[PDB]
Design a protein around this nucleic acid. Structure first.
Ligand SMILES: [Mg+2]
Length: 864
RNA sequence: CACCCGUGCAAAAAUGCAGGGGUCUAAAACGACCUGAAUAUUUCAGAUCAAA
RNA sequence: ACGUUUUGAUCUGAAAUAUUCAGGUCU
């Protein structure tokens, strides 16, 4: 649960050399430091405004007392006495991988004698553990635009590298090699693909406006640049290529020129056509003010609208105007085509209220709101304040409202601008020249993934570049060494990368479809749904032609031909699934009932009661299985009369829930796969780390378990392990995880029964995503799925035994395929056998092999 | 309902007590004023669509 | 042949709720 230290105000307890600093929470997540402690003699910094006083300063515990919030007193622990409790009891603590000195020399110049540096090293390593989950399912989406309906095992995107340009990859067209030629033919297949129009914000250039493809010069410049990033988050790539993203200024002329255009077209759409796109709105606001100048009006309207600097004021204007407009004249039925613009002009006029005129009323209001004894005062603090405020603005928003009828907005929208402002151009969100190549690269990463996880990419990169900056204002405040090595100096600019990415968070939206892609989006509807036609592929797009017949002039009374052109093309959930899953594969993925019936457990109770009532004319256990076997056998007509029409209505009303079960299932089986992408990156990362720590590891591309042996001193000698157990190995392991005997023991037990060859397949199964990229074959017999750890591993234990269906395997592994198939669930002992390569890191090894310990949200029970 | 660490206690190898951990995993950070983003419902208005 | 009235769907706009990620404040 809670930790009473950080509830008492102690941020972190740094230890340098002999003394022990101790920090606290600044404004936000920057660190002010409270007091150093040389032993039992504390010198307090930060004299005025203390965050906590210290009571009993022992040799081991630092009992503090804090007065932020309700005043709690907690005891912290001496970092110098860590690992030295029962033995001279004063030393700096190394990290539990016992790789702290190598990590310090590798990023900075030399070793150190603190732990302020190594808490910063584990936040520079950490932006691979949160960028391999958002760069894998952005390359899973691109691998499902092949639509191969087969065993898919290609390697197109991880083959890509920015070591070559386009013009020499162009020379692989007429190439002579039997594998280089196929890759350009794999590229010819991909630029001639029509499903690139799904990602039109990064593949289409605006040139009314008729946007078309990029050149082959630049489509290669996105697929390579998004392909190198996925290959960098899965593997080692010794040399400068390991330091790839940390020097993105080393890219060629092409890749900056594609980052400088994929970033400009949303930032020039929002600046170069701002007054044009708000011309109907600025002219209202000029008419209601008439005393300010319109050049600074569109400045303070721009800070209100999109930049959103000064919009946070501690009181919700979106609730404030509604207590103002409760029961007033603007709740009519006529204003409903106006409330898009009426409610944001009304909101803006209050925003200029609480800046220019009565800004002193706002601080009165915020201080009022922090004294809520109940909630009922809040609905009469605003309504009391709106009772004042409508007396001020009722003439003004009437002048707005009568100027917003059905035809004034037509005649206002046809005027010439002639506003010619340069006070506005100061506060523009800046273009692609004064923003870095990192921000432009993780911009282009957010052009391939959904809106729930743009907001988790470019806010966990707000946080990590702010928890790197805050350490660089402690060890720079304490005079410690800070200069990174010159081949790694990316993070001096983490003060401005925090400033670029906050600017990036202000305007990123989802990757917009284009208009002229209905015809290929409609084709990828009927094979999600299984409405296949017996005619050939070159003779069914004319069906797609004559139903759409362009944007939409669909025929009248055409039945299900134009049902699935009106609703399920323009629906939200379909736009998520066809950018994500394989189109012509995920109907027969949905045919397994117990995988589906699992997935709508964590689909909410208010969600299923919308669809149970849409299909049945009552308990949520048996309500869910009533329509889990309706999503599975969905049925549509091929390409009495009451029953055969009402079964269509119960198949057309489940079509949104079907289309979101196959999204949540087909996503969460690669958020689980990205746990093993992290692990197989953090094994090839620790190979070049432990090999420089004087630990003779050896090769790892032949055998992935070589690190977790060479950490624990065990070796093969004739093809298997004949170095069995005693006590003296556990004291000589090169890791603080493998010190204790039983955790050394059972990893040694599991390592002796895991062959080399099945791990090398499990290597390029989680990295090229082949466990789920052809999921429909691998899921065909489930007896029961209880959690996504089980559903992932049965999908990965079949893919082994699908390939080890002819090859010779030894008896220890060959038990597990029999244990896989005498049941139909996954084999809980086989799942720990090939998960060993990342078994040197014990807490990664336990949390990635037993469900219950796997998931943050779903805690369970250990194995023992 | 994890792993490591420290102190306290019984014991010889581990468990109890309360802790701490950004240097433990994907995972350091109370609470209540908001903001940005999207989830999912409900109500209203609207425009298409299917069927009766 | 041609218009209905309903029902059930999508979507867009507004409001209400709950969840999640992040930072803006404050004690
Ligand atoms: Mg960490």
């Amino acid at each position: 649960t809670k930790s009473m230290a950080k509830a008492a105000g102690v941020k972190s307890v740094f230890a340098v050399g002999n003394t022990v600093y101790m920090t606290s929470f600044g404004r936000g997540n920057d660190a002010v430091l409270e007091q150093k402690i040389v032993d039992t003699s504390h010198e307090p910094l930060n004299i005025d405004d203390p965050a906590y006083q210290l009571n009993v300063v022992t040799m081991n515990g630092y009992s503090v007392t804090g007065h932020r919030g309700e005043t709690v007193s907690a005891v912290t622990d001496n970092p110098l006495r860590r690992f030295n409790g029962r033995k001279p009891e004063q030393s700096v603590p190394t990290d539990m991988l016992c790789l702290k000195p190598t990590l310090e020399k590798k990023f900075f110049g030399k070793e150190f004698d603190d732990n302020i540096h190594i808490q910063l090293i584990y936040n520079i390593l950490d932006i691979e553990k949160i960028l391999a989950v958002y760069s894998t399912n952005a390359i899973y989406a691109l691998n499902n635009m092949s639509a191969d309906e087969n065993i898919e095992n290609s390697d197109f995107f991880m083959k890509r590298t920015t070591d070559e340009t386009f013009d020499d990859f162009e020379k692989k067209k007429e190439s002579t090699n039997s594998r280089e030629k196929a890759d350009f033919d794999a590229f010819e297949k991909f630029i001639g693909n029509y499903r690139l129009a799904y990602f039109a914000d990064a593949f289409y250039v605006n040139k009314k406006a008729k946007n078309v493809l990029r050149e082959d010069k630049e489509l290669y410049s996105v697929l390579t640049l998004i392909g190198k990033l996925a290959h960098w988050c899965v593997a080692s790539e010794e040399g400068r290529a390991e330091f790839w993203l940390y020097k993105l200024d080393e890219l060629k002329d092409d890749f900056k020129n594609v980052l400088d255009v994929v970033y400009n077209r949303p930032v020039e759409e929002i600046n170069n056509r701002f007054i044009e796109n708000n011309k109907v709105n600025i002219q209202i606001l000029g008419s209601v003010y008439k005393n300010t100048d319109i050049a600074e009006l569109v400045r303070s309207y721009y800070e209100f609208l999109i930049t959103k600097k000064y919009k946070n004021m501690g009181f919700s204007i979106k609730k404030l105007r509604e207590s103002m407009l409760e029961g007033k004249g603007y709740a009519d039925k006529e204003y409903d085509s106006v409330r898009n613009k009426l409610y944001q002009m009304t909101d803006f006029i209050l925003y200029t209220g609480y800046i220019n005129e009565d800004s002193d009323r706002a601080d009165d209001l915020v201080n009022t709101l922090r004294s809520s004894l109940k909630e009922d005062d809040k609905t009469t603090v605003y309504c009391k304040e709106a009772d004042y405020l409508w007396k001020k603005y009722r003439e003004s928003i009437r002048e707005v409202a009568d100027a917003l009828d059905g035809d004034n907005i037509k005649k206002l929208s046809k005027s010439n601008i002639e506003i010619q402002e340069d006070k506005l151009r100061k506060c523009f969100i800046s273009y692609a020249d004064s923003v870095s190549e990192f921000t432009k690269l993780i911009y282009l990463l957010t052009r391939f993934l959904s809106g729930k996880e743009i907001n988790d990419l470019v806010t966990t990169l707000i946080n990590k570049f702010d928890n790197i900056r805050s350490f660089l204002e402690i060890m720079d405040e304490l005079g410690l060494d800070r200069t990174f090595t010159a081949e790694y100096s990316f993070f001096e600019g983490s003060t401005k990368y925090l400033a670029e990415l906050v600017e990036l968070n202000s305007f990123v939206k989802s990757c917009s479809f284009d208009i002229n892609a209905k015809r290929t989006m409609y084709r990828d509807a009927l094979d999600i749904l299984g409405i296949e036609s017996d005619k050939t592929e070159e003779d069914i797009e004319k069906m797609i032609d004559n139903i759409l017949q362009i944007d939409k002039k669909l025929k009248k009374n055409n039945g299900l031909r134009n049902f699935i052109a009106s609703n399920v093309i323009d629906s939200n959930r379909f736009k998520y699934l066809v950018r994500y899953g394989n189109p012509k594969k995920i109907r027969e993925t949905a045919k397994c009932k117990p995988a589906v019936r699992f997935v709508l457990n964590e689909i909410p109770d208010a969600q299923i009661e919308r669809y149970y009532e849409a299909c049945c004319p009552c308990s949520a256990n048996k309500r869910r299985e009533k329509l889990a076997d309706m999503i599975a056998e969905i049925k549509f007509e091929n390409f009495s009369r009451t029953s055969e029409a009402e079964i269509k209505r119960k198949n057309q009303a489940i079509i949104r829930l079907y289309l979101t079960v196959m999204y949540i299932m087909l996503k969460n089986l690669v958020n689980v796969n990205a746990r093993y992408v992290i692990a197989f990156h953090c094994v090839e990362r620790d190979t070049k780390l432990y090999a420089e720590s004087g630990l003779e590891v050896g090769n790892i591309e032949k055998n992935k378990t070589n690190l977790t042996m060479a950490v624990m001193g065990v070796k093969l000698e004739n093809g298997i392990i004949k170095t069995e157990f005693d006590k003296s190995f556990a004291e000589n392991a090169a890791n603080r995880y493998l010190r204790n005997a039983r955790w050394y023991k059972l990893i040694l037990d599991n390592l002796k029964k895991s062959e080399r060859a099945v791990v090398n397949e499990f290597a390029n199964t989680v990295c090229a995503l082949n466990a789920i990229r052809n999921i429909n074959i691998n899921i065909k017999e489930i007896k029961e799925v209880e959690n996504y750890f089980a559903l992932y591993h049965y999908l990965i234990q079949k893919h082994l035994e699908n390939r080890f269906a002819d090859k010779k395997v030894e008896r220890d592994t060959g038990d597990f395929i029999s244990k896989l198939e005498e049941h139909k669930t996954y084999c809980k002992d086989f799942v720990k056998a090939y998960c060993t390569p990342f078994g040197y890191n014990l807490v990664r090894y336990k949390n990635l092999t037993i469900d219950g310990l796997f998931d943050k949200n779903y805690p369970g029970k250990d194995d023992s």
